Design a protein around this nucleic acid. Structure first.
Length: 231
DNA sequence: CCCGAAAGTCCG
DNA sequence: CGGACTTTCGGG
């Protein structure tokens, strides 16, 4: 069965505008885990828009199919475009898509794709369906997969006053001993971000609970100004 | 335009 | 370790 014509068109149009000179540093930035065509976001967005203008966005029945086919292509711009396309189908995504999103997280995994999936798509789903959090978050934490662990930390990133504090700190407690950079840094990020909403609770937490040095330092990057640095 | 964020390198 | 610096991206 041939590639979806929308995907084939996107592949042709991206490839015709590839930049091997840019592709080298772009690939190095992601520690050479991926091939790149060398197309940065402003142009990549326009090239996608070109193809939508010519062909129209595919019927929603093909949404998941399009994403998977782009995910399977070698160059990283196709996963970036896949996430752009998923946003265009946003109003069709619901709690039944959690396993689909899980599978995107653990395939072709790196911080660029995982950070674009978790606080937005999964964040929105669990905001509307908080009773489903316990069907997934314990498995993610227990898994061997650091990107599922990062997902458990960051899905509440944008919740602000809707943050479940007890849950957030429980998740962090489960992962605070991890030696993995992407876990330590995610803990620092979500604490730094939540401190914009409730600085007192984040300050108390980091002064009274064990965290990796990186995690603590990132968490209080800003709020240390409000409390001071004791001699 | 600005700022803050993922990262990233380089240095002591 | 952690500070200083860098580019790219998203959002005032």
């Amino acid at each position: 069965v041939p590639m979806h014509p929308f995907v084939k068109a996107l592949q042709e149009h991206f490839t015709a505008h590839q930049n091997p000179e840019k592709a080298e540093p772009m690939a190095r930035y992601m520690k050479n885990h991926f091939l790149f065509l060398g197309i940065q976001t402003p142009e990549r967005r326009q090239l996608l828009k070109d193809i939508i203008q010519i062909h129209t966005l595919p019927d929603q029945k093909d949404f998941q199919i399009i994403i998977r086919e782009l995910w399977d292509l070698p160059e990283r711009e196709f996963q970036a475009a896949a996430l752009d396309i998923m946003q265009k189908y946003k109003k069709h995504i619901n709690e039944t898509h959690i396993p689909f999103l899980e599978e995107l997280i653990v395939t072709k995994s790196w911080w660029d794709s995982v950070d674009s999936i978790v606080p937005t798509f999964l964040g929105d789903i669990f905001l509307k369906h908080p009773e489903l959090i316990s069907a997934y978050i314990p498995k993610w934490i227990a898994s061997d997969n650091i990107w599922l662990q990062r997902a458990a930390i960051l899905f509440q990133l944008k919740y602000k006053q809707k943050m479940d504090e007890e849950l957030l700190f429980w998740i962090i407690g489960q992962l605070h001993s991890s030696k993995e950079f992407f876990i330590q840094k995610a803990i620092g990020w979500v604490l730094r971000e939540y401190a914009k909403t409730n600085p007192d609770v984040v300050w108390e937490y980091v002064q009274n609970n064990e965290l990796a040095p990186l995690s603590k330092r990132e968490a209080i990057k800003h709020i240390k100004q409000n409390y001071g640095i004791n001699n």
